[PDB]
A paper describes a structure:
[name] virions contain a single-stranded RNA genome and rely on a structured region of its 5′-untranslated region, referred to as the internal ribosome entry site ([name]), for translation of all the encoded proteins. In contrast, the [name] requires only eIF2 and eIF3 for start codon recognition, binding directly to the 40S subunit and eIF3. Translation initiation by the [name] begins with binding of the [name] to the 40S ribosomal subunit. The [name] as well as several [name]-like IRESs share a common conserved fold encompassing around 300 bases, which form two major domains (II and III)6.
Residue numbers in the entry:
A (entry chain A): 2 to 217
B (entry chain V): 1 to 82
C (entry chain a): 2 to 102
D (entry chain X): 2 to 72
E (entry chain R): 2 to 133
F (entry chain D): 163 to 227
G (entry chain W): 2 to 130
H (entry chain h): 2 to 25
RNA sequence: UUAAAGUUGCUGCAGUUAAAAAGCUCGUAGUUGGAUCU
RNA sequence: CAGAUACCGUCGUAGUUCCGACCAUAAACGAUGCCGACCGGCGAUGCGGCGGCGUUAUUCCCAUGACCCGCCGGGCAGCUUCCGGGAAACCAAAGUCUUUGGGUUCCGGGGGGAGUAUGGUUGCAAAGCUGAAACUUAAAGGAAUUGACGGAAGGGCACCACC
């Protein structure tokens, strides 16, 4: 944010967080992350500071936008809570996803059919997937991450401080990132609430597939 | 650099890290040149303008590439006070 | 070449430790290095349980258990296979094996 | 480490020369048992008389007789 | 023991990946599909590869297969995935929150939000696991 | 396959020191006979013909000829 | 114990430099440490610094530019003749082009360069580049 | 082995110390 | 014929990158020998420094191979060092030339004294350090040629370092480490921060960010 | 005999496992010694 | 057991024990001198201190103790890390070293000969401290790597192994 009244975070957005609970992180706290913390309540849950979170969102947005070809943004999610979210994001924004298995040697090996040279790297969790991150250390990729109250910031460039654990929290952050880069590029609008519902970016689980298919 | 006559004799003039001021190496592949975009203060849309940073491979391992990106942004007013 | 950082014995910041005689050998070993093993079992074993249970003059008499602390000098263990050697890296893990299912 | 004060001088110099004795070379030259035991007494050459001719077995990995003189 | 060679599974992978529209869940259907689509010697090779093209299709209609990428099943998984309940799960008339969270919002001047409900802090402190 | 796919030759050179026997194994490549390239392919080898590009249909069209 | 505070000061800043830190707290401080830092500062190798005055001995907080590779001290202080100077720098400094030997002299604390000008000798303190 | 040859050395030394006595 | 497989490749073959310095500026990984080759030149020559047999041991006997050390310089701007292992010494050599070509580094040169003419020596004194060899290069007045052992003298000749005072301490016999160290030294000459370089950097559009359109076309 | 020898090392080497830190502490000479005064 | 003046067993002297004198050496080891400065995290633990809801010693007030959540200073350690080193094993010191200097003490200079000869000196003696040389020799050694082997541990197979 530029301190601007336009980009300044509105209430309806806040409520989305508070429901999805992105302001609740783990009991362990990395010293790199202490900057983004607010205070630790009893029951050892650290409370992430939301203005800070917002600003990081916008920052990573500007970083993504700066890039000309939108296919030069790679987006990666190792674990299952990220998969769907990343795909949708990529579709909305026109970036190249990798969900499921990352293959070591994807960035550094020109013989592979997987090979790609992305200008930027967006990543769901630093802890879960080190692999793409360390490759980005051989090829010069700036890097974004969704960082819990505990994450190594090793080789991340610009980190976003949220709960990356629970489905609802991840979904939200992605959808908000998307809503942001899109409101930025000049597509969509700052007035109209986006057609696309955040609920779309969530993680299924098989239990809910069963519930909703056997409700019909 | 310059001989007595004033010519620049050099192959190239290397870029120094924006955070820590070290010289970014000819072959250092952990280096970053990061582009951050500028909005239009009325609209919130994209200008075509951007402010650029560099960070060497040292500071990336230390993880404090992040901290430095951040306070660089504050010094450029791309990040709000607080 | 130094094999273990802790040198096999648990002694830290004290000079010398009271030595104990091995269970199996009688070989002398400092109390820190000694491979220790605690044993709780029942006096009578598997089958004779069900057998003796019938011959009681008491109803619901629960068998006493036998409690013994063993020490095994480094050699004797490896022979008894209470302890077996493991790889350079997997050496480092001091977490006790999973007898808990 | 070494002692680096100013007024340290002699402690340096003194100490050096002791360790200088521990050097096999210099010891040989400046002790003087070396020259005593040397059959030449420090000369390049020596003139001598022939006592007898002597074959001398070569050392192990190769077989020969070396033709020597006892002078 | 009956287990497919590298040849069998690699071949059925590439055959499926290129020709996914032409294959069907019947054995002899895709058997005659592969007598055409690819060039294979003998028989026992042919038959096996086709069997695996089939087997792999019965696994495809279940969902994503690890080995193959088709734009058709990318599109059917673009249908399947896209879903949304009539209302969001992010909409609740009352969302419960801890006093301190309320403080952090009060820094951002949001202490005026209506939907909130302040819930009682938990009195004991034990978040930790009893070491041993 | 090794029968029609490769050619082996064994010989004896006769010299002051003795005889040196020798073996030379040569393998031929595949397909149509140029006096080389035995026609029938390895039972392992699987060749896949790339899909001939097909026009994606737009709206139904009937053409009488 | 602590002797030669100058040494301990410059060790500290040289380390905070390799670490790539922005500021340093060096303590204690001296009317010598201060004039050394000042001579360093005029050429820019360092930046501006601020003396926390405590009723005992100083602390000095130094602002840092990445421009300082090595900062060092030579213990003991040797008496450096004018004629010697050359040898000294040719031993110490990375090049004729840049870097400095700092000495105290009857005139004041300064650079080998400036003393050459003033035609004075003195004692060596340290050097930087 | 070292310990033992240190031993054989002290046996030898002691015997020398006999075979020359200060009466010799 | 050369078919570029990377983003950096296409930009080169399509002449969108004028000189090599646009690469070095952004410290891009150079993954293709033909980049280096197309860029220079007949200007490149190369040495076989050493061919050493290495042996491995199997139940069967010793299975031998070969390590080739090739030093490819362009006299005056650039050197490279490469090391390759193979069963066949020929293969090993041309492989090592590929490897060396892949690693090419620019060599800064400073004046010794009053700056007149073109830079003939090392800017300030540098230390390459490899595995117990410590090579150290020091400024030298014009005309002194290179004072060193034969091995680092090869590299430094090929760099276009005309005059140098070399010190080397360590176990200097072992060739890999001697060469790799002296190479380190002439690497670190563009990482050394002198007062010359103190001007703040004006940045430049990265090749990637600049040509991205013409990239999308191919 | 000098360089090579940074293999006598003030510049300038070493001392966990290669040669090597005293069992341990007290201790006189010896070396070394915090800030502060135009 | 071929032999066993050795491992194994039954005995058993000196010794092992206490007091009183000597002896001064141990893989006396962290195989890492001592004082000092600076340089990443992370949880633990021992001692003192300081703060903090809430439990308990029964029901309310203060002390006090036990647990609990932190903070500070010394400790014994640990995990972790492209801090940096290192020949490497490894070391948050074995780091801040050719970009070489905080103070200081002991001490090494290829392997043997040898911690022997001799003299001096201490002891009651066993020995301790101090300590050469002639000669002799191209290596002796340190880490790691593939092998081969083990009377070392685990898996694995085979009706030319068994059930
Ligand atoms: Mg061993
Ligand atoms: Mg103690
Ligand atoms: Mg002891
Ligand atoms: Mg040398
Ligand atoms: Mg040698
Ligand atoms: Mg000499
Ligand atoms: Mg010299
Ligand atoms: Mg030496
Ligand atoms: Mg030893
Ligand atoms: Mg030793
Ligand atoms: Mg000691
Ligand atoms: Mg005194
Ligand atoms: Mg003073
Ligand atoms: Mg008997
Ligand atoms: Mg007995
Ligand atoms: Mg008895
Ligand atoms: Mg006594
Ligand atoms: Mg001793
Ligand atoms: Mg010792
Ligand atoms: Mg001492
Ligand atoms: Mg306490
Ligand atoms: Mg209290
Ligand atoms: Mg503590
Ligand atoms: Mg030194
Ligand atoms: Mg010797
Ligand atoms: Mg002695
Ligand atoms: Mg005597
Ligand atoms: Mg060994
Ligand atoms: Zn035992």
């Amino acid at each position: 944010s530029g301190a601007l009244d336009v980009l300044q975070m509105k209430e309806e957005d806040v409520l989305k967080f508070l429901a999805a609970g992105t302001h609740l992180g783990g009991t362990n706290l990395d010293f790199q992350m202490e900057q983004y913390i607010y205070k630790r309540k009893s029951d050892g849950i650290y409370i992430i500071n939301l203005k800070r979170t917002w600003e990081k969102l916008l920052l990573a947005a500007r970083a993504i936008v700066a890039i000309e070809n939108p296919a030069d943004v790679s987006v990666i999610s190792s674990r299952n809570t990220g998969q769907r979210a990343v795909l949708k994001f990529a579709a909305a924004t026109g970036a190249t996803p990798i969900a499921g298995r990352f293959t070591p040697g994807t960035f550094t090996n020109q013989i592979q059919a997987a090979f790609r040279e992305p200008r930027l790297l967006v990543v769901t969790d630093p802890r879960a997937d080190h692999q793409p991150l360390t490759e980005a250390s051989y090829v010069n990729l700036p890097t974004i991450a969704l960082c819990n109250t505990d994450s190594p910031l090793r080789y991340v460039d610009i980190a976003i401080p949220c709960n990356n654990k629970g489905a609802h929290s991840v979904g939200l952050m992605w959808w908000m990132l998307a809503r942001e880069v899109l409101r930025m590029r000049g597509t969509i609008s700052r007035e109209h609430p986006w057609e696309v519902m955040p609920d779309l970016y969530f993680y299924r689980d098989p239990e809910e597939i069963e519930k909703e298919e056997q409700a019909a | 650099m310059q001989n007595d006559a004033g010519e620049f004799v050099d192959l190239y003039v290397p870029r120094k890290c924006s955070a820590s001021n070290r010289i970014i190496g000819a072959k250092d592949h952990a280096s970053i040149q990061m582009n951050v975009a500028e909005v239009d203060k009325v609209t919130g849309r994209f200008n075509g303008q951007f402010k650029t940073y560099a960070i060497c491979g040292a500071i990336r391992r230390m993880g404090e590439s992040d901290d430095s990106i951040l306070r660089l942004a504050k010094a450029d007013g791309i990040v709000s006070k607080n | 070449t130094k094999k273990r950082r802790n040198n096999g014995r648990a002694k830290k910041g004290r000079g010398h430790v009271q030595p104990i005689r091995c269970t199996n050998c009688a070989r002398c070993v400092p109390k820190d290095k000694a491979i220790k093993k605690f044993v709780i079992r029942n006096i009578v074993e598997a089958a004779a349980v069900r057998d003796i249970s019938e011959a009681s003059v008491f109803d619901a008499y629960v068998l006493p258990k036998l409690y013994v602390k063993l020490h095994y000098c480094v050699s004797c263990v490896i022979h008894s296979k209470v302890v077996r050697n493991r790889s350079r890296e997997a050496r480092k893990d001091r977490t006790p094996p999973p007898r808990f299912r | 480490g070494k002692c680096r004060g100013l007024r340290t001088a002699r402690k340096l110099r003194s100490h050096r020369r002791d360790q200088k004795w521990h050097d096999k070379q210099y010891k040989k030259a400046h002790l003087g048992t070396a020259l005593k035991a040397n059959p030449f007494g420090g000369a390049s050459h020596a003139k001598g008389i022939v006592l007898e001719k002597v074959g001398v077995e070569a050392k192990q990995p190769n077989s020969a007789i070396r033709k020597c003189v006892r002078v | 023991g009956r287990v497919r060679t590298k040849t069998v599974k690699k071949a059925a992978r590439v055959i499926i990946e290129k020709y996914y529209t032409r294959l069907g869940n019947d054995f002899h259907t895709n058997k005659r599909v592969c007598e055409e689509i690819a060039i294979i010697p003998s028989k026992k090779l042919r038959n096996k590869i086709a069997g695996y093209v089939t087997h792999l299709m019965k696994r495809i209609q279940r969902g994503p297969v690890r080995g193959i990428s088709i734009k058709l099943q990318e599109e059917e998984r673009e249908r399947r995935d896209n879903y949304v309940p009539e209302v969001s799960a992010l909409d609740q008339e009352i969302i419960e929150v801890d006093p301190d969270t309320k403080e952090m919002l009060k820094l951002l001047d949001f202490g005026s939000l209506s939907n909130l409900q302040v819930t009682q802090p938990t009195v004991g402190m034990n978040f930790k696991t009893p070491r041993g | 396959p090794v029968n029609y796919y490769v050619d082996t030759a064994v010989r004896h050179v006769l010299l002051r020191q003795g005889v040196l026997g020798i073996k030379v194994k040569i393998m031929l490549p595949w397909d149509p006979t140029g006096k080389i390239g035995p026609k029938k392919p390895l039972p392992d080898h699987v060749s896949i013909v790339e899909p001939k590009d097909e026009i994606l249909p737009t709206t139904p069209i009937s053409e009488q000829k | 114990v602590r002797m030669n505070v100058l040494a301990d000061a410059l060790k500290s800043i040289n380390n905070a430099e390799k670490r790539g830190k922005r500021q340093v707290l060096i303590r204690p401080c001296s009317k010598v440490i201060v004039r050394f830092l000042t001579v360093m500062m005029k050429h820019g190798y360092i930046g501006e610094f601020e003396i926390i005055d405590d009723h005992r001995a100083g602390k000095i907080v130094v602002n840092l530019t990445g421009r300082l590779n090595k900062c060092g001290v030579i213990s003991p202080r040797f008496d450096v003749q004018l004629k010697d100077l050359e040898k000294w720098q040719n031993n110490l400094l990375p090049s004729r082009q840049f870097g400095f030997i700092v000495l105290t002299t009857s005139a004041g604390i300064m650079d080998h360069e400036e003393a050459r000008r003033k035609h004075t000798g003195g004692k060596i303190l340290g050097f930087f580049f | 082995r070292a310990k033992w040859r240190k031993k054989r050395m002290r046996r030898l030394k002691r015997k020398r110390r006999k075979m020359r006595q200060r009466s010799k | 014929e050369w078919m570029p497989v990377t983003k950096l490749g296409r930009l080169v073959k399509d002449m969108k990158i004028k000189s090599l310095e646009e690469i070095y500026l952004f410290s891009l990984p150079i993954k293709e020998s033909e980049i280096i080759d197309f860029f220079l030149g007949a200007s490149l020559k190369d040495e076989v420094l050493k061919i050493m047999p290495v042996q491995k041991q199997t139940r069967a006997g010793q299975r031998t191979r070969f390590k080739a050390f090739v030093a490819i310089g362009d006299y005056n701007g650039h050197v490279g060092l490469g090391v390759k292992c193979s069963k066949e010494v020929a293969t090993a050599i041309r492989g090592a030339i590929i490897l060396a070509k892949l690693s090419i580094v620019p060599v800064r040169r400073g004046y010794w004294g009053n700056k007149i003419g073109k830079p003939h020596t090392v800017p300030c004194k540098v230390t390459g350090r490899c595995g117990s060899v410590l090579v150290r290069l020091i400024p030298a007045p014009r005309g002194t040629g290179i004072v060193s052992a034969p091995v680092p003298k090869k590299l430094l000749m090929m760099a276009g370092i005309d005059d140098c005072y070399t010190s080397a301490r360590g176990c200097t016999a072992t060739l890999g480490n001697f060469a790799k160290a002296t190479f380190d030294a002439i690497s670190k000459t563009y990482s050394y921060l002198t007062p010359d370089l103190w001007k703040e950097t004006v940045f430049t559009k990265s090749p990637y960010q600049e040509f991205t359109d013409h990239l999308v076309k191919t």
